[PDB]
Amino acid sequence: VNPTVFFDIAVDGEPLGRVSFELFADKVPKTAENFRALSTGEKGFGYKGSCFHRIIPGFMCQGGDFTRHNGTGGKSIYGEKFEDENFILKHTGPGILSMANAGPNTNGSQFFICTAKTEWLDGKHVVFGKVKEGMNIVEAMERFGSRNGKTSKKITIADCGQLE
């Protein structure tokens, strides 16, 4: 019953592969719904064509800034920002999907995919999904990051949507 969404990832425009995520609507429905809708584009804006602007190997891949492409933009389907829904779920390891933010109750559209356990983020970032399929594609993306997060090739969501 939890929704599944996919990203088709490209590297300098070349198709890399597909990542699919289970969104934990059963535990964080509001946060899951934002990501789901941004992935289908059904509100007239969303993730299709956007980039992963900050990738730090051994840490995470961050994306979702579909307005400014650099970590300074993005918006939710509820308004520019929405609240931290809950912190039930923890950053337990690679594959965890969690909201980026700039303070309490500042969720927009930016998110990160963990490539390591990031327990120090527990209670600060809302975990709302996990990679279901294509963690290998996330690992391939990760290799284009760097210590300071700048990517050496352009990592984009060439297509995205809902499966099932």
Whether 82 is a known active-site residue: answer no
- From the list 83, 74, 73, 80, the residue with the least C-alpha distance to 30 is 83
Choosing from 23, 82, 121, 144, which is the catalytic residue?
121
Phi then psi for residue 83, to 5 deg, are -70, 160
CA distances from 155 to 37, 75, 92 (A): 21, 20, 25
Whether 2 is a known active-site residue: answer no
Q: Are 18 and 137 in contact (CB under 8 A)?
A: yes
Whether 69 is a known active-site residue: answer no
Q: Are 38 and 21 in contact (CB under 8 A)?
A: no
Whether 59 is a known active-site residue: answer yes
Whether 162 is a known active-site residue: answer no
At a CB cut-off of 8 Å and minimum separation 6, what does 140 contact? 16, 17
**Resolution of the structure in the document, Å:** 1.2
Domains: count for the chain: 1
- The 8-class DSSP code of residue 102 comes to S
**Torsion sign across C-alpha atoms 54, 81, 6, 98:** positive
Segments forming the whole domain that contains residue 131? 1-164
CATH number of the domain at 47, please. Answer: 2.40.100.10
